């Protein structure tokens, strides 16, 4: 350490275990996938569809390369312009023309000069896409991997004990293929969830006859007619038969079966062909056809039983080749014969006709069209497109030796007859693999050969596709659409009479990428209220989407946690409510593998000791090795002294000796995510309360002056750094100039001529109406290094994360105010500006043109007094920095109706007050600007001239210093670079002037659009929800004055009074330990401030810091300087921070020693006197400092009321919602709760005369205002709408 940003505050970490791997980059997976997206990624999607073969014109075209253009708009200007942060994508293609009725040769090699198509949104910053000025993020989808996996249904069909098995060949993007069993013992297939059909139809479509299908699965027994050959190891473990003697030596008599010793004695006897009696082969089934050698008639066909007439015909014909099927009771099942005996189709053409009839319903079949339709379904590249991970899963599940192979499925008989160019390539590398027959054989081994069944719950069967793969998929869809359009446009073309740019159109691919990036199930609107929420929203995987399950259906299996999730998927950061379990989160050290699976690092463990090596293992690799857990005590630096270390083999925690371990975890922070690791003492609290706290810590609000948490973790220096909310120095050096919104840094001569300059963002609007700002912390003349911090953002500290404030906590029931998770406050919380945040609300006002005339923004507004006209300027826009109230006029606008105009001015929403910080005017081109727009334009050009010549003077001073450091001896490159930088600054100023003075982008149909920014300081009030980090959510109760609060013997008044009844109910105890550790930290901070208040020597302070920092993590206080220790003691005036890890935390002895080191009691709890009466208490309470946070569930956006509001047009009912004056919906169960009491008069008055009646709603108001009491009951308008809707269905309904 000992850097510049680390010498200002050092937190004492209670970490006894070592650290072998530091915390990596948090959002690295999305930026890595987007870097890999720009041959895999985009280039494969280009090369897979751009070869086009024309039918009649014979016009082909091939691309040679692509290039991305320069982004014409910066993202800071793109957030205000309202467009998308995109880049032009120009593809350089070459068009060739083949001469007709001649040899294969091209005429002209004309190439299109970078034809433009599409516009990709460039990922900028930390992974936020900008499409309409709003930061959008694309979360990663978790779906089932392509391949082959098997399953069985429990009690689905016929409630039989024989569990039927199913198979499924999942492609990447194409047609599916299933293989399921049946309780009638017959396999059946289906294509794309259509109607079922037997397996013999697909095998006849492949080109397989019956005598070659039935002979390759089971063995054949040769019969000589009727003596048969004795097959060894066949009758053992099978159905018993009569006596069989080999050479008049019968080892096994009649009525018994061949055992293992009987099979050994039979195999040691030299068997041969024996005389089989005729009453044994009548139950068998023939393998192939048996015909006569002389006549040649088909007396015995294939897949038929051997009866007595066929046996006598075979004995008369003399055919000695009679084969049977080895059919046992359990080890061999005759399912193929049962499927062949059902379907009567015998030829390939009728099978293709049946396939074309099952696929296309109600269509006349054609023998020349079914062959074409069957080829573009399973055996083509343009429509099936099975990827490499699907082939890897296929070769891993079937049992093939090689990993890589062909993408499309290969068949032996289907590809042998084809004489195409691509068909000759696949048959040369393959060796008749027959993948479909291998799938059928593996399913047979599952059914009767006693295989294993894998459930879809692991991470080896689920892949994680990022933004790049989904972008490549939607670009592939758009490329197929533009390929079909280009084929129809250039089916008949000339050599050079037409342009290649007019063939392809950017409109369908642009509409597809706009529909993907703008509104989809994966484009989630992010929340920029915190850096923690910003870093945990991008590092989040989900199972919802177009290629996955939905949250509406049942998910009782996929909502449970699997043992594969240990180390890869976080089991704590999961949102409760509707979708609990479907929205998971990535771990800290977890990352994406090369195929899409999740890999976690482990340590290589030698048989004697543990080495310092890392190796990422996937989910299908952890089932073989014995991975040790974190319960491994160490005596030396690498030693195991336990005779039985707890470890897991396949997710089951067992005990094993340490001479058989293979892997071990690298860190105890592997299980939890980044949003769950910041909660201190997570090992003590319950899992559900930690799950509630991990969501309560996700929706905080940044305050004005954020304070550091006293009980942190130590990993908060990375979660605030990887989010990109704070600026970092790229090259360390000397800070030349600094301001409130600009930092000038001079690059030193080591990592060097142009110095860098930073522009800090001021108070702007975020996505959740939260004010964000960046304030610097360094001074002038400082020497910084590469990677240090310079400015802290919203809810940010010197290099650690800081969400809220620290307050006093006393667990005591105070007069029934803390009743059920209620929070009491004090006056000194409100009056000291502690929890008062800043909210920025945006208001707009457009001015379009109607059929009468256009609307203006003039100041001559009728029916407006002088109380509101004083704030308006001459242009009609309110002044910058002017205080506006609720209901005032800010933007004046009139609408002509027909001298006589209608008021349509923008009004302030009620209850909101504040100053107007920024006014932005968006004018249309061709319209003359007013005085306010001209003032904004002249202020903008003056500000950009100020920063332009300031940067030019800084660069000129840097170049002058660089030449003055070299002309001291006894040149042209310095003045040449100065002239080049001057020309670059002039070009940048010209581009900025041309981008400012041009008319911005507006909606089609409007003339002028203004945006007024408001800033309201939200106070704290009763009715506000406030939670903690340990998982104690609640609302506040009252604001008690400071004189009526409990106080200690010293004089400190307790600010927040909690309820001690929640500790046995919620079963968490970590909050009391956090309170005790915060009390110890505040005691050490008070002792440090009392020592530094007097003029004491630095040696005693150094001895005190050495006593409190490294007790019984070793740091030296005498390393930095002699005044740096005084600066560190001055920076710790409020309390030294503590860092407790998630699972390697501190015990009670260290906290007791820390409490005894200061002037604090040993037990951590003391007595305090009451503030209401002044007397003492009977039991001592726990007093300490707990870190709190203010939630976004305010009270201003919740409470509302209305009496008269707007009505609808279909049914005369009020609207719904806090906006547009919508009344609260009377529920269906509320009517039942009212009718359970009876009370028909309050049920008829709250259903008919209140809302639904068009006359009663006026009559009741007239009777209330006037004074009389006479109501009229009638039928509502909704029943009239219902009967008029029923009457439009040719059903007579009359109110009799």
């Amino acid at each position: 350490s000992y850097s510049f940003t680390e010498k200002k505050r050092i937190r004492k970490d209670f970490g006894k275990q070592r650290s072998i791997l530091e915390v990596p980059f948090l959002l690295a997976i999305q930026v890595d996938s987007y870097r890999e997206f720009l041959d895999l990624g985009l280039h494969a999607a280009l090369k897979s569809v751009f070869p086009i073969s024309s039918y009649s014109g014979n016009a082909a075209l091939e691309y040679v390369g692509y290039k991305l253009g320069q982004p014409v708009f910066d993202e800071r200007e793109c957030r205000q312009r309202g467009m998308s942060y995109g880049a032009p994508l120009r593809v350089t293609v070459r068009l060739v023309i083949y001469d007709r009725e001649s040899s294969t040769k091209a005429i002209k090699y004309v190439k299109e000069q970078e034809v433009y198509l599409g516009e990709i949104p460039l990922m900028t910053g930390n992974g936020t896409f900008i499409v309409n000025g709003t930061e959008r993020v694309i979360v990663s989808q978790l779906h089932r991997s392509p391949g082959v996996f098997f399953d069985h249904d429990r009690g689905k069909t016929h409630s039989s004990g024989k569990l039927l098995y199913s198979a499924r060949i999942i492609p990447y993007r194409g047609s599916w293929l299933d293989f399921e069993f049946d309780p009638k013992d017959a396999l059946f297939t289906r294509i794309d969830r259509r109607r079922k059909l037997p397996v013999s139809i697909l095998l006849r479509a492949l080109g397989y006859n019956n005598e070659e299908m039935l002979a390759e699965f089971f063995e054949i027994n040769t019969f000589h007619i009727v003596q048969l050959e004795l097959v060894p190891e066949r009758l053992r473990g099978e159905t018993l038969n009569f006596d069989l003697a080999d050479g008049d030596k019968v080892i096994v008599e009649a009525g018994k079966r061949i055992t293992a010793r009987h099979v050994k004695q039979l195999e040691a006897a030299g068997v041969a062909a024996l005389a089989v009696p005729d009453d044994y082969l009548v139950g068998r089934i023939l393998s192939h056809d048996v015909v006569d050698g002389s006549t040649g008639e088909l007396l015995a066909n294939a897949n038929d039983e051997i009866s007595e007439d066929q046996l006598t015909a075979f004995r008369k014909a003399g055919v000695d080749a009679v084969g049977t099927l080895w059919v046992n009771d359990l080890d061999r099942g005759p399912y193929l014969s049962n499927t062949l005996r059902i379907d009567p189709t015998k030829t390939q053409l009728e099978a293709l006709v049946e396939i074309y009839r099952m696929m296309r319903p109600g269509e006349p079949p054609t023998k020349e069209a079914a062959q074409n339709l069957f080829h573009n379904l399973f055996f083509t590249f343009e429509r099936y497109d099975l990827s490499t991970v699907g082939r890897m899963k296929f070769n891993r599940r079937v049992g093939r030796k090689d990993v890589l192979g062909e993408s499309v499925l290969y068949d032996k008989k289907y590809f042998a007859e084809r004489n195409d160019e691509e068909s000759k390539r696949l048959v040369a590398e393959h060796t008749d693999t027959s993948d479909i027959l291998e799938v059928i054989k593996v399913l047979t081994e599952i059914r009767n050969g006693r295989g294993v069944v894998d459930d879809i719950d692991h991470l080896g069967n689920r892949r994680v596709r990022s933004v790049g793969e989904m972008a490549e998929n939607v670009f592939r869809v758009g490329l197929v659409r533009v390929e079909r359009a280009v084929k129809e446009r250039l089916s008949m073309a000339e050599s050079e009479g037409l342009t290649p740019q007019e063939l392809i159109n950017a409109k369908p691919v642009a509409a597809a990428i706009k529909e993907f990036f703008g509104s989809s199930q994966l484009s989630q609107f992010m929340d920029q209220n915190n850096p923690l929420s910003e870093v945990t929203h991008k590092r989040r995987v989900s199972a919802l989407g177009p290629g996955g399950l939905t949250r509406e259906r049942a998910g009782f299996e996929v909502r449970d946690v699997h043992p594969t999730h240990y180390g890869r998927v976080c089991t704590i950061e999961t949102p409760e409510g509707p979708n609990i379990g479907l929205i998971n989160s990535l771990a800290v050290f977890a990352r994406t593998n090369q195929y899409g699976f999740l890999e976690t690092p482990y340590r290589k463990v030698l048989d004697g000791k543990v080495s310092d090596d890392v190796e990422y293992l996937s989910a299908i690799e952890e089932n073989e090795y014995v991975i040790a857990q974190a319960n491994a005590l160490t005596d030396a630096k690498n030693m195991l002294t336990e005779q039985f270390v707890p470890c897991r083999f396949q997710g089951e925690s067992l005990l094993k000796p340490p001479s058989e371990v293979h892997f071990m975890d690298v860190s105890p922070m592997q299980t939890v995510s980044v949003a769950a690791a910041l909660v201190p003492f997570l090992e003590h609290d319950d899992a559900n309360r930690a799950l509630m706290g991990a969501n309560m810590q996700r929706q905080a609000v940044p305050t004005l002056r954020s304070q550091k948490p006293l009980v942190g973790t130590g990993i908060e220096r990375a979660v605030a750094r990887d989010s990109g909310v704070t600026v970092n120095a790229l090259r360390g050096g000397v800070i030349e100039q600094i301001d409130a919104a600009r930092i000038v840094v001079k690059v030193n001569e080591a990592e060097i001529a142009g110095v860098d300059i930073y522009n800090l963002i001021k108070y702007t609007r975020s996505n959740q109406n939260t004010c964000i700002n960046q304030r610097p912390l360094v001074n002038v003349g400082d020497v910084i290094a590469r990677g240090d911090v310079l400015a802290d953002g919203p809810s940010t500290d010197i290099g650690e994360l800081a969400l809220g404030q620290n307050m006093l906590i006393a667990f005591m029931p105070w007069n029934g105010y803390n009743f059920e998770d209620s929070i009491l406050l004090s006056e000194r919380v409100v009056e000291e500006d502690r929890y008062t945040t800043i909210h920025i609300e945006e208001l707009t006002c457009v001015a379009r043109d109607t059929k009468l005339g256009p609307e203006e923004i003039s100041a001559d507004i009728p029916n407006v007094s002088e109380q509101a006209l004083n704030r308006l300027d001459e242009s009609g826009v309110v002044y910058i920095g002017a205080e506006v109230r609720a209901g005032d006029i800010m933007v004046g606008k009139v609408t002509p109706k027909g001298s006589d105009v209608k008021d349509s001015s923008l009004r302030v929403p009620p209850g909101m007050d504040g100053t107007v910080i920024d006014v932005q005017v968006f004018t249309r081109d061709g319209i003359e600007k007013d005085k306010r727009a001209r003032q904004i334009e002249e202020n903008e050009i003056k500000r950009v001239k100020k920063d332009f010549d300031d940067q030019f003077r800084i660069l000129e001073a840097a170049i002058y210093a660089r030449l003055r450091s070299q002309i001291v001896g006894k040149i042209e490159r310095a003045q040449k670079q100065i002239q080049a930088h001057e020309k670059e600054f002039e070009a940048r100023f010209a581009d900025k002037r041309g981008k400012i003075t041009q008319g911005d982008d507006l909606a089609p149909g409007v003339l002028k659009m203004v945006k007024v920014f408001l800033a309201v300081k939200r106070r704290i009030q009763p009715g506000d929800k406030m939670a903690g980090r340990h998982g104690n959510k609640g609302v506040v109760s009252n604001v008690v004055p400071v004189e009526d609060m409990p106080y200690m013997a010293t004089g400190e008044s307790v600010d927040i009074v909690l309820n001690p009844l929640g500790v046995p109910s919620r079963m968490n105890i970590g909050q009391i330990l956090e309170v005790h550790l915060g009390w110890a930290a505040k005691g050490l901070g008070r002792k440090i401030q009392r020592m530094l208040e007097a003029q004491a020597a630095v040696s005693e302070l150094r001895k005190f810091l050495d006593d409190i920092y490294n007790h019984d993590q070793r740091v030296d206080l005498s390393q930095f300087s002699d005044e740096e220790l005084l600066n560190l003691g001055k920076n710790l005036i409020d309390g030294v921070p503590m860092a407790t890890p998630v699972f390697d935390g501190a015990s009670e002895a260290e906290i007791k020693r820390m409490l005894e080191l200061a002037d604090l009691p040993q037990s951590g709890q003391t007595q305090l006197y009451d503030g209401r009466t002044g007397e003492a208490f009977d039991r001592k309470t726990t007093v300490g400092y707990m870190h709190y946070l203010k939630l976004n569930h305010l009270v201003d956006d919740k409470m509302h009321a209305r009496s008269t509001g707007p009505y609808s047009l279909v049914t005369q009912q009020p609207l719904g919602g806090k906006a547009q004056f919508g009344g609260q919906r009377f529920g269906e169960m509320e009517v039942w709760a009212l009718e359970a009491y009876g009370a028909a008069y309050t049920l008829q008055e709250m259903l008919t005369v209140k809302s639904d009646d068009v006359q009663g709603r006026n009559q009741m108001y007239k009777n209330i205002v006037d004074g009389e009491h006479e109501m009229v009951a009638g039928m509502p308008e909704s029943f009239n709408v219902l009967v008029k809707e029923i009457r439009s269905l040719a059903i007579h309904m009359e109110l009799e």
Binding site: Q629, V1035, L1061, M1199, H1200, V1210, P1214, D1266
Partner: protein, 686 residues
């Protein structure tokens, strides 16, 4: 409304695609045959049989234009027209008199009942098919414009335009004398279009999202019956955030001032018109929005005994809607009585409830006489009263109504309750001491006063001033537990009355609050104790399971019986650890009586909250003191390794990952149980 003149007839899909198909019962045919006939794939002669085109041509070649056969809606229209149901009823009566098969009997009684209903209603059988199709009125659906002069799309308008376009094309093809195959194709397309208009998604699902139709916006979740008929959005309402307030009675509740101004605004207008301070309603509204001081006086005067309605939005039982007399308070949060929230089951972690204002003359009496909170005392489920002291009151009442061995100020004789209250406040006696007081209590048969002596504590004597005279002291001399105070509330409600029980429940909460703010209970790291023999029992069980594992790995016992005996001895060890923890928590405190030491019940922070109720059971104390036992797996089995650490000690990642399996399954079970409970509640209501 309007109508569409169709050149070709078309049948309704509700009488065809339904599972009791009425046309199949009327014409004695199946569903697939009439499906092939009605969609122009077969022929019907005019007895009833499926007939294709080759049979039609071979019959026309031999009939010489004497055997007419129609196909489509005209054939089924003639078959429904030419039948006479009066003779058909007698013919099917002879058929049911002849045929005696059971499924034939069921079909015969179904057809006879259908024919009887058709002749009783007087409806003709030809009214199943239709010729004139009516449309909806144009005011029933809006054409909502968007920003920029655009128009939002609709669902029924596109289907209506498709129907009118196909009808115009069919009329032009019939007028221009088209060949028969394209007329049959246009009639089939018109049939599919009308069948998609009447019920979309039942035949072909004519669209990436299928739009709604006339049968989709009535039947389903977004239908008119469950959105605009049973529950409608009403006015004079509004939500807030609940906040507990102890300084209010149980017959009243809090209300924000701006909500009270916005809800009772017509009453404010009527009061300003009656007082004469404002001439018109516009000047009164401007005086209200200008926020003078007389507006708050008018608002405080207009609602004094005017009740409102309160209702939590997730409601389960009939006590979810109650009535209170509101008072004007500050802030933006509705204040509620703490004893009411037991019936609402409303925690204070940011829950919202919507109010409703009864404004008629009869609704106020209906909300006062049978919906006030002083009348809904007993639950509709069982006879126990819902006014039970909650987690904050019963803790102070249990701390107040117990005794110890030796305290200061014991052994003295007091006069009455007033002497106890005069001697307690100046701290001359303890809160709990074995004293002998004298109390007066009446006897009911009738009032019969009586004075006796009793030996009790100081806190139970201080509790004897708020109980009514009908209750004896023997029902309150026991320590105030949960079930004991529930029995006391039931005995106070049984033989005394209502209003005295209401004011007794009012004073009991105030007494519990005033003694809980004086007790000052707090749980810390020192109060939660660990057993001393826990490590010894754990090492003994570790040696036992090591011996069992050695005997299993040596080759004597199989893995299943070894796993069963391991989890058996671990459950026995967990039970022994729980017993030792209960023994070292309950009998922890010791005291002395006149020099000699004596044992008593401990006064720890966890033990008081465990024994007094309104908290977790003994399993929650076992999980915080000793080992939590054996956790389960989601597939049904039990994990072999235990969790040999409480929540006070540290936990490794293994037992935390084991506990996560039991943690998430409970959340999934509560979500599925809530959904199934809502569905079962709806079915049991209906």
């Amino acid at each position: 409304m309007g109508h569409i003149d169709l050149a070709s007839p078309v049948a309704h899909i509700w009488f065809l695609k339904s599972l009791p198909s009425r046309i199949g019962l009327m014409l004695d045919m199946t569903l697939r045959d009439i499906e092939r006939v009605l969609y122009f794939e077969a022929y019907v002669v005019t007895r009833r049989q499926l007939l294709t085109e080759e049979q039609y041509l071979t019959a026309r070649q031999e009939y010489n234009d004497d055997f007419d056969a129609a196909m489509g809606a005209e054939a089924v229209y003639e078959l429904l027209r030419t039948i006479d149901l009066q003779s058909e009823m007698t013919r099917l009566r002879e058929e049911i008199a002849s045929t005696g098969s059971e499924t034939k009997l069921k079909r015969l009684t179904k057809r006879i009942k259908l024919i009887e209903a058709f002749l009783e209603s007087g409806n003709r059988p030809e009214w199943m098919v239709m010729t004139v199709l009516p449309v909806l009125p144009p005011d029933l659906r809006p054409l909502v414009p968007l920003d920029g002069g655009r128009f939002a799309t609709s669902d029924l308008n596109d289907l209506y335009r498709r129907v009118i376009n196909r009808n115009n094309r069919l009329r032009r093809l019939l007028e221009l004398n088209a060949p028969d195959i394209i007329v049959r194709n246009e009639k089939r397309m018109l049939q599919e279009s009308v069948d998609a208009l009447l019920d979309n998604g039942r035949r072909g699902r004519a669209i990436k999202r299928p739009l709604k139709s006339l049968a989709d916006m009535i039947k389903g979740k977004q239908g008119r019956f469950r959105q605009n008929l049973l529950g409608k959005r009403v006015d004079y309402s509004g939500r807030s955030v609940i906040t507990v307030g102890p300084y209010l009675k149980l017959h009243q509740c809090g209300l924000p001032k701006k909500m009270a101004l916005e809800l009772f605004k017509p009453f404010v207008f009527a009061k300003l018109q009656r007082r004469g301070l404002a001439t018109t309603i516009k000047a009164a509204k401007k005086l209200v929005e200008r926020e003078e001081a007389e507006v708050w006086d008018i608002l405080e005067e207009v609602i004094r005994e005017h009740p409102v309605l309160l209702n939590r939005a997730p409601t389960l039982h009939r006590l979810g809607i109650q009535a209170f007399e509101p008072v004007l308070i500050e802030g933006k949060a509705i204040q509620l009585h703490p004893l009411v929230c037991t019936a609402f089951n409303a925690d204070f972690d940011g829950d919202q409830m919507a109010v409703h204002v009864p404004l008629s003359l009869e609704a106020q009496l209906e909300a006062r006489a049978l919906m006030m909170s002083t009348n809904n005392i007993l639950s509709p489920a069982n006879g126990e009263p819902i006014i039970v002291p909650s987690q904050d009151v019963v803790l102070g009442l249990y701390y107040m109504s117990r005794a110890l061995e030796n305290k200061k100020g014991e052994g003295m004789v007091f006069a009455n309750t007033s002497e106890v209250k005069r001697a307690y406040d100046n701290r001359v006696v303890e809160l709990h001491a074995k004293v002998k007081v004298r109390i007066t209590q009446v006897d009911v048969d009738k009032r019969t006063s009586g004075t006796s002596i009793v030996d009790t504590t100081v806190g139970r004597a201080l509790l004897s001033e708020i109980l009514p005279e009908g209750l004896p002291f023997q029902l309150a001399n026991t320590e105030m537990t949960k079930k004991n105070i529930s029995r006391l509330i039931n005995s106070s409600y049984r033989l005394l009355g209502l209003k005295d029980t209401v004011v007794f429940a009012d004073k009991l909460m105030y007494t519990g609050y005033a003694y809980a703010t004086r007790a000052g209970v707090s749980i810390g790291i020192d109060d939660m104790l660990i057993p001393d023999e826990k490590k010894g029992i754990l090492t003994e069980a570790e040696a036992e399971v090591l011996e069992i594992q050695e005997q299993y790995q040596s080759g004597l016992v199989t893995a299943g019986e070894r796993y069963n005996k391991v989890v058996d001895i671990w459950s026995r060890t967990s039970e022994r650890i729980a017993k030792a923890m209960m023994d070292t928590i309950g009998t922890e405190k010791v005291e002395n009586a006149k020099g000699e030491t004596i044992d008593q019940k401990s006064m720890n922070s966890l033990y008081i909250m465990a024994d007094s109720g309104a908290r977790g059971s003994q399993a929650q104390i076992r999980q915080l003191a000793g080992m939590r036992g054996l956790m389960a797996r989601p597939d049904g089995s039990i994990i072999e390794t235990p969790i040999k650490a409480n929540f006070r000690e540290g936990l490794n990642v293994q037992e935390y990952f084991n506990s996560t399996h039991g943690a998430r399954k409970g959340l999934a079970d509560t979500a599925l149980k809530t959904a199934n409970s809502g569905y079962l509640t709806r079915r049991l209501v209906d």
